[PDB]
């Protein structure tokens, strides 16, 4: 049983790199604009895509859209991917991030990839990157 052991990274595709980038907000949230966020989004796109991720961005999605998107990405087979990456660039309160619309608890989002719900990432790295 091997201390040097490394994840299998020999699959067909690297995997998906979801970015959720939020710049402006439903104005009754009263949250300031996040000015540099698109620079961040593009810079993340460049680097991850350079590591062979399939990068997929979404700008200013509302909670429902955000959810059914991430729900989709977690209901597609990752059978033939090395790992999964998911970035949230937004405002954050407690264990919540904000879509355009309302806040969503981060356990809700990650839970969609825990093993009992997402078979095909079992044993594979699931990387989340949160700039709240």
């Amino acid at each position: 049983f091997d201390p040097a052991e490394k994840y299998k990274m020999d699959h067909r595709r690297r995997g998906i790199a979801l970015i959720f980038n939020h710049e402006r907000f439903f104005w009754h949230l009263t949250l300031p604009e996040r000015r540099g966020t698109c620079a961040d989004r593009d810079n993340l796109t460049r680097r991850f895509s350079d590591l062979g991720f399939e990068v997929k961005c979404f700008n200013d999605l509302k909670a429902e859209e955000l959810l059914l998107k991430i729900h989709e990405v977690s209901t597609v087979s990752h059978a033939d991917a090395d790992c999964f990456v998911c970035v949230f660039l937004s405002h954050g309160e407690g264990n919540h991030i904000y879509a355009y619309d309302a806040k969503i608890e981060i356990q809700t989002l990650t839970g969609l990839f825990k093993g009992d719900k997402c078979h095909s990432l079992v044993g594979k790295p699931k990387i989340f990157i949160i700039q709240a």
Partner: protein, 70 residues
């Protein structure tokens, strides 16, 4: 804190970007396809403390992770 086995959570805590992401990105570009990923994230902790914030990461990773090219 991560949801389960093999989750890794990276946390951060001006129109050109956040200190955290510019530095995560620079390190990804330089060292991302050769260094173990937590090693790289640690470099990012260092690079962000040098700015005159400390980011951090929470690993439930069970093995070493590299992004060697395909």
């Amino acid at each position: 804190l991560p949801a389960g086995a093999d989750f890794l959570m990276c946390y951060s805590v001006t129109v050109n970007g956040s200190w955290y992401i510019q530095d995560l990105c620079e390190m990804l570009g330089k060292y991302g396809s050769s260094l173990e990923f937590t090693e790289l994230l640690t470099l990012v902790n260092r690079k962000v403390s040098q700015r005159r914030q400390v980011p951090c990461f929470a690993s439930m990773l069970t093995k070493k992770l590299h992004f060697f090219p395909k």
